[PDB]
Amino acid sequence: EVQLVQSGPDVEKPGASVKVSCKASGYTFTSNYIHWVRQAPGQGLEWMGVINPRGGSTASAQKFQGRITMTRDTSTSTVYMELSSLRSDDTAVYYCARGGRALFYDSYTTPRDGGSWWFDPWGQGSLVTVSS
Amino acid sequence: AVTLPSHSTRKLQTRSQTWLESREYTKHLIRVENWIFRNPGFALAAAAIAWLLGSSTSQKVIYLVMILLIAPAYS
Amino acid sequence: AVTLPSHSTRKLQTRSQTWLESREYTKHLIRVENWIFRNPGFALAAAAIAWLLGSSTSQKVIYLVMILLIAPAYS
Amino acid sequence: QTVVVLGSQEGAVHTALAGALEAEMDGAKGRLSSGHLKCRLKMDKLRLKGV
Amino acid sequence: QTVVVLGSQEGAVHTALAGALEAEMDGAKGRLSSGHLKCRLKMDKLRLKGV
Amino acid sequence: DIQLTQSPSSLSASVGDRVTFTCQASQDIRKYLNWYQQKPGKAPKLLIYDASNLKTGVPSRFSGSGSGTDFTFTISSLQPEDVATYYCQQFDDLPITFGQGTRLQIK
């Protein structure tokens, strides 16, 4: 079925970089933007950024420019998000879900939305814990 | 770094006052005025140049205006 | 606030390189180049003006250079 | 060979902007205070209320 | 009244100098390069050491 | 970067109640809002796309409305499997903002 499956939880040191995978199943991999969304335990959701699995272009929030990098793998149908310059604030759970009308690249704002804007695919999530 | 697009090239003519219009409609003239105050000999030099072109006694004044407005700005 | 004294008016010619000489010896030419790229019709307008002055067929080119270097800079 | 910071050019861009029109912000709305508009005008349905 | 600070003119004057000679200054002591000097040499106190 | 206030912070009700949630954006997001419920640490349950529409597979006890900037989510009948944390999400201008959350508790 249509499903995104992530890697396991990771424990990293402050100042290092973590890499979280996001593999697709059940749909054409180059047809849905993969959005990455963090969630601290004592806080709600927060959108990290967006990659297109076609062409590998990125965009992200103002709180993380320069700290986040998103790569793709069209062969294995996988999305890699590498978060660098880790701190104790980055201990969170990371999510990755679609959102369609993902024809060419970037974002696609004013055209259509909804129908798993990015609701469906999320799977198990990835706990990332930054400590010593 | 020389921010060469003066926006007076593409000024908007709407019914409000513009961004610097009040200080804009004198600035090139007083720049030429300060330049000819600081370099008075180029007036005599440009007269000797412009007298050699045109041979019409009314094109001479046109070449004077041309040279004496080239020399402050496009110089 | 228009800081009109360009110091190229009073440049010093000493054996060292100056303050901005390397970026200075192209700037007026590429300013005129960008202006005639953005306003191509004034070339035909200035040709029709300058063809009416001089009646000499070599003063025409001089008036062309004069007008087309007035129009970007002191304009 | 040394490098040179050429410095804040903010006032030079202000002097380069001699010809633009001002505007303001309300949150995200760019409020323009200039500009015009052509408009046909239907005075069909007007009563005087006091005949 | 639009009361504008009109900002900061560093890049304005840095563009305005294009014929300047950069010096450096330390305790005031303004040291300067790009000078020339017309010192006339006097010989005849010179002598080859051990001809 | 539109700030999306979600009212209230947390609620509690018994089984079979009607409950409403408010989300107010600081700017005009006209119909670009959607709604999540998230069970803690789990794959969530789907509520609302486009601020007024249900998805196939969702039970019809959930509904959403809202026209200008104020948006009302509505559960007609509360059930014991509807305890979750409720979120609302902007669509416009793309610093995509979520609400703070709305927790429920079974009485």
Swiss-Prot record, chains D, E:
Sequence position, cross-link Glycyl lysine isopeptide (Lys-Gly) (interchain with G-Cter in ubiquitin): K29
Compartment list: Virion membrane; Host endoplasmic reticulum membrane
Modification note: N-glycosylation plays a role in virulence in mammalian and mosquito hosts, but may have no effect on neurovirulence. Ubiquitination by host TRIM7 promotes virus attachment and fusion of the virus and the host endosome membrane.
Membrane topology of this protein: Multi-pass membrane protein
Superkingdom of the organism of origin: Viruses
Record text about domains: The transmembrane domain contains an endoplasmic reticulum retention signal.
Known function: Binds to host cell surface receptors and mediates fusion between viral and cellular membranes. Efficient virus attachment to cell is, at least in part, mediated by host HAVCR1 in a cell-type specific manner. In addition, host NCAM1 can also be used as entry receptor. Interaction with host HSPA5 plays an important role in the early stages of infection as well. Envelope protein is synthesized in the endoplasmic reticulum and forms a heterodimer with protein prM.
Subunit field text: Homodimer; in the endoplasmic reticulum and Golgi. Interacts with host TYRO3, AXL and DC-SIGN proteins. Interacts with non-structural protein 2A. Interacts with host HAVCR1; this interaction likely mediates virus attachment to host cell. Interacts with host NCAM1. Interacts with host HSPA5. Interacts with Aedes aegypti SRPN25, APY and venom allergen-1 salivary proteins; the interactions do not affect Zika virus replication in human endothelial cells and keratinocytes.
Entry protein name: Envelope protein E
Organism: Zika virus (isolate ZIKV/Human/French Polynesia/10087PF/2013) (ZIKV)
